[PDB]
């Protein structure tokens, strides 16, 4: 009866859910401000155009996005813990809802009502809030609530951010340390730790989006635990089109530093499991294509790390055990966020209302 | 016992309205950025200087005439050295010194005085908690040029405090100063006041250089909100952007007008500087606040300036640095491999330390 829904953009489970995923992606004006008036029309064009290259990438990494598997694993593992940790909230049923990928919020919501859920928690898998990710996903949830649950059957609450959750910080530091063990001792303290997070379009950044600064907070907290032993730097990956994106591209920095450093390590700072971003962009692109493939290494993604899973369960417990169906920052985010169809009152969306 | 020089550094500000021309000349004579030249800049620098002087003099005129930077810097330095005499006896006589990059006294001037004072050890204490190659990096490159010209036989052993984003006294002074300023807000609406940490912005081509500034400022903001238990909505925004070029966004002014109508309170916090200057006294007080129709619900946090808790923090920072035996943070060699300058330091280990 208690629904724990993990949420993120998603990824195509099979090589061809790609064109559908991509179309859904570019059709969302809340993600990348392409055209407030013709985003969808423009989207199917961009989708039909980018499908070949992307489709080939999912093939070069096994033939699909591992997101769904890892998300389902994490969700149920977190629920098993809450069952023993929060017996006060009876069984905790794991759910997964992706913004663009397969299990869409609409599908998932149907189930939840069919399974008779009364209390639910939208658990954003992005530790750092961005209107483009969590915001978009919340605007979707609102649409679903209205169309699927008019009688306001389910009572929702949202975990909208957690940049410095203990398990998260502790899991990343442990993984960073053991990965450093692969470098030769006399050079270990010199390896540069490049925290690579998905970039953001300057248009979003300039709305005063919360994302940039929150990633920075996670990074610094990790370096404190590591006692600032190594040189570090927060850089950004991805980026699409001519429009400008954020501060120093992971790709350019790596190439520029290659000749100067004893080594480099990439850290998937903004995500919780493996996906096309790490398995391809980083592994086959940045690393497996550089002449320095040797002095280049990547920190393990969180995936099924138990410190991390325990940190998430703890994160949830603190959430359930309190008021606030959302953080103090959310109302400000929606005040600054840009959308054709936004949630006007966060207070009407999350709560009893029955 | 020979004196240990504690040197506070920062870009600077014209002490009095007449300094404006010299300040602006130096600024436009720097080609570590600004122009390219060497032979035809001792010229253009003075042309762009005379061209700007009027505007800038009117600004300082609007703030009581002159920048308060030198005043606060010399004071802070003196207060810090007085504590250090008691706290760090083996470096016994600690002498106050300031060295500005464009304002008086320039690096060369202060260096001459230190050499004539018989200083053996010196600490280049950057006043910026957040390192930027365009600021703390600029000072370090000038220091190097001066060391080579005014002290080729290096009688002085330098070390540098290049950053301190989460020093305890810093985070505590900002907390307290923010709570204090929040209390002069209604009460039924005090928790809803939005805290806008406002820092000097950076051009996008400097940010895309991999510069450290943006992330470190964010580190200070998160730590302050932690102390304050996230009771209030907040956001890190940027100011002072000028020119046709693209700057790091979330424009303070721009965002203040946007939120004005929909919020019942807004506070601006001088998150990246340590005392009053043109940015807070003029840009914010007279611009953002002063000319807005929401002046009433807009307030600015008090600058650290002479804050005692903040001074004690700087003392701890200096004590730790002196007793760590490190000549600079582990980050500095990365900043220099990423920075862009026409005359940079090639070896940081040759710049700092004993070279008898």
From Swiss-Prot, chain A:
Q: Which Pfam families match?
A: Ferrochelatase
Q: Which GO terms describe its molecular function?
A: ferrochelatase activity
The UniProt entry's GO biological process terms, in alphabetical order, are: heme biosynthetic process
Function comment: Catalyzes the ferrous insertion into protoporphyrin IX.
Q: Does the keyword ATP-binding apply?
A: no
Topology class, membrane: Peripheral membrane protein
Classification from the root reads: Eukaryota, Fungi, Dikarya, Ascomycota, Saccharomycotina
Keywords carried by this UniProt record: Heme biosynthesis, Iron, Lyase, Membrane, Mitochondrion, Mitochondrion inner membrane, Porphyrin biosynthesis, Transit peptide
* Protein name as annotated: Ferrochelatase, mitochondrial
In terms of one coarse class, where is the protein primarily found? mitochondrion
Catalytic reaction annotation? heme b + 2 H(+) = protoporphyrin IX + Fe(2+)
Q: Does the keyword Iron apply?
A: yes
Q: What is its EC number?
A: 4.98.1.1
Miscellaneous remark of the record: Ferrochelatase interacts with protoprophyrinogen oxidase, and associates with complex 1 of the respiratory chain.
Q: Which InterPro entries match?
A: Ferrochelatase, Ferrochelatase_AS, Ferrochelatase_C, Ferrochelatase_N
One GO cellular component this record assigns the protein to is:
mitochondrion
UniProt-annotated catalytic positions: 314
Where does it live in the cell? Answer: Mitochondrion inner membrane
CDD domains given in the database record:
Ferrochelatase_C, Ferrochelatase_N
Q: In which pathway does it act?
A: Porphyrin-containing compound metabolism; protoheme biosynthesis; protoheme from protoporphyrin-IX: step 1/1
Task: Report the sequence similarity comment from the record.
Answer: Belongs to the ferrochelatase family.
Swiss-Prot record, chain B:
MF terms from GO for this chain are: ferrochelatase activity
The record's catalysed reaction(s) read: heme b + 2 H(+) = protoporphyrin IX + Fe(2+)
User: What domain of life?
Assistant: Eukaryota
**Keyword Iron annotated:** yes
Under Pfam families, the record lists: Ferrochelatase (PF00762)
Gene3D superfamilies tied to this protein: 3.40.50.1400
The record ties this protein, via InterPro entries, to:
Ferrochelatase, Ferrochelatase_AS, Ferrochelatase_C, Ferrochelatase_N
Question: Where found in the cell?
Answer: Mitochondrion inner membrane
Indicate whether Transmembrane helix appears among the record's keywords.
no
Q: Which residues form the active site?
A: 316
Q: What is its EC number?
A: 4.98.1.1
PROSITE patterns for the chain: FERROCHELATASE
Q: Which GO terms describe its biological process?
A: heme biosynthetic process
Give the residue spans that cross the bilayer: none
Q: What extra comment accompanies this record? A: Ferrochelatase interacts with protoprophyrinogen oxidase, and associates with complex 1 of the respiratory chain. Acidic phospholipids or fatty acids are important for the ferrochelatase activity.
Q: What does this protein do?
A: Catalyzes the ferrous insertion into protoporphyrin IX.
Instruction: State the similarity comment.
Output: Belongs to the ferrochelatase family.
- The name under which this protein is listed is Ferrochelatase, mitochondrial
């Amino acid at each position: 009866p208690t629904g724990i829904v993990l949420m993120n953009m998603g990824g195509p489970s099979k090589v061809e859910e790609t064109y559908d995923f991509l179309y859904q992606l570019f059709a969302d004006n809340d993600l990348i401000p392409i055209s407030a008036k013709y985003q969808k029309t423009i989207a199917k064009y961009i989708a039909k155009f980018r499908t070949p290259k992307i489709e080939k990438q999912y093939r070069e990494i096994g033939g699909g996005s591992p997101i769904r598997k890892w998300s389902e694993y994490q969700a149920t593992e977190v629920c098993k813990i809450l069952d023993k940790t929060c017996p006060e909230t009876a069984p905790h049923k794991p759910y997964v809802a992706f913004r663009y990928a397969k299990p869409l919020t609409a599908e998932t919501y149907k189930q939840m009502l069919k399974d008779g859920v009364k209390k639910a928690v939208a658990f954003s898998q992005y530790p750092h809030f961005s209107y483009s990710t969590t915001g978009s996903s919340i605007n979707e949830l609102w649409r679903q609530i209205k169309a699927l649950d008019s009688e306001r059957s389910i009572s929702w609450s949202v975990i909208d951010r957690w940049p410095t959750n203990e398990g998260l910080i502790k899991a990343f530091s442990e993984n960073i340390t053991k990965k450093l063990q692969e470098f030769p001792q006399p050079v270990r303290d010199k390896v540069v730790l490049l925290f690579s997070a998905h970039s953001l379009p300057m248009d979003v950044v300039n709305t005063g989006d919360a994302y940039p600064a929150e990633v920075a907070a996670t990074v610094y907290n990790i370096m404190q635990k590591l006692k600032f032993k190594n040189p570090y730097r927060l850089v950004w990956q991805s980026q699409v089109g001519p429009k400008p994106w954020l501060g120093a591209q992971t790709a350019e920095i790596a190439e520029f530093l290659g000749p100067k450093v004893d080594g480099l390590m990439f850290i998937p700072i903004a995500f919780t499991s493996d996906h096309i971003e790490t398995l391809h962009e980083i592994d086959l692109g940045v690393i497996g294509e550089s002449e320095y493939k040797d002095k280049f290494k990547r920190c393990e993604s969180l995936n099924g790390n138990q410190t991390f899973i325990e940190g998430m369960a703890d994160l949830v417990k603190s959430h359930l055990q309190s008021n606030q169906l959302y953080s103090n920052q959310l109302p400000l985010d929606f005040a600054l966020g840009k959308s054709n169809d936004p949630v006007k009152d966060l207070s009407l969306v999350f709560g009893n209302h029955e």
